[PDB]
Enzyme design. Sequence first.
Site, mmCIF file in Angstrom:
data_model
loop_
_atom_site.group_PDB
_atom_site.id
_atom_site.type_symbol
_atom_site.label_atom_id
_atom_site.label_comp_id
_atom_site.label_asym_id
_atom_site.label_seq_id
_atom_site.Cartn_x
_atom_site.Cartn_y
_atom_site.Cartn_z
ATOM 1 N N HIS A 47 0.826 -1.201 0.000
ATOM 2 C CA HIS A 47 0.000 0.000 0.000
ATOM 3 C C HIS A 47 0.861 1.252 0.000
ATOM 4 O O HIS A 47 0.638 2.177 -0.789
ATOM 5 C CB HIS A 47 -0.922 -0.020 1.216
ATOM 6 C CG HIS A 47 -1.947 1.069 1.226
ATOM 7 N ND1 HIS A 47 -2.037 1.992 2.245
ATOM 8 C CD2 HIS A 47 -2.935 1.374 0.353
ATOM 9 C CE1 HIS A 47 -3.037 2.818 1.999
ATOM 10 N NE2 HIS A 47 -3.596 2.469 0.855
ATOM 11 N N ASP A 90 -6.276 1.993 -1.859
ATOM 12 C CA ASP A 90 -6.975 1.646 -0.630
ATOM 13 C C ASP A 90 -7.805 0.382 -0.799
ATOM 14 O O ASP A 90 -7.836 -0.470 0.095
ATOM 15 C CB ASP A 90 -7.860 2.807 -0.197
ATOM 16 C CG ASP A 90 -7.067 4.019 0.191
ATOM 17 O OD1 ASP A 90 -5.831 3.897 0.309
ATOM 18 O OD2 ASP A 90 -7.677 5.089 0.379
#
EC number: 3.1.1.4
Length: 122
Positions: A47, A90
């Site tokens: 991420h 996300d």
Amino acid sequence: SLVQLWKMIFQETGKEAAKNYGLYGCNCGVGRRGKPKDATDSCCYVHKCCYKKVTGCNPKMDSYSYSWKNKAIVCGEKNPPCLKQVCECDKAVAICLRENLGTYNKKYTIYPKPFCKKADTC
């Protein structure tokens, strides 16, 4: 924005995002990177590395537009390049989070990040 990601995490994991992943491992939540501890921390590793490929925005502060469909995350309504990507960033980190839920360590939930070995370059 970071509130959207926290919601996004909960909707695929059912756990309060910042409560469970705010200090997990060496790459989950606030702080820097480290060599990951497990697959949970490593997907926080992915991420943060897609987050550096953002260009014109502040992902922790800038909100985006997205919706929660038939148990499927659809960011896919027209968003500016970054705001599209971070939200896809996300969602990807929300999706993998469900994929490694059986691995989650209850001892790694708040982890001393300074002691973690420094991660390589993504």
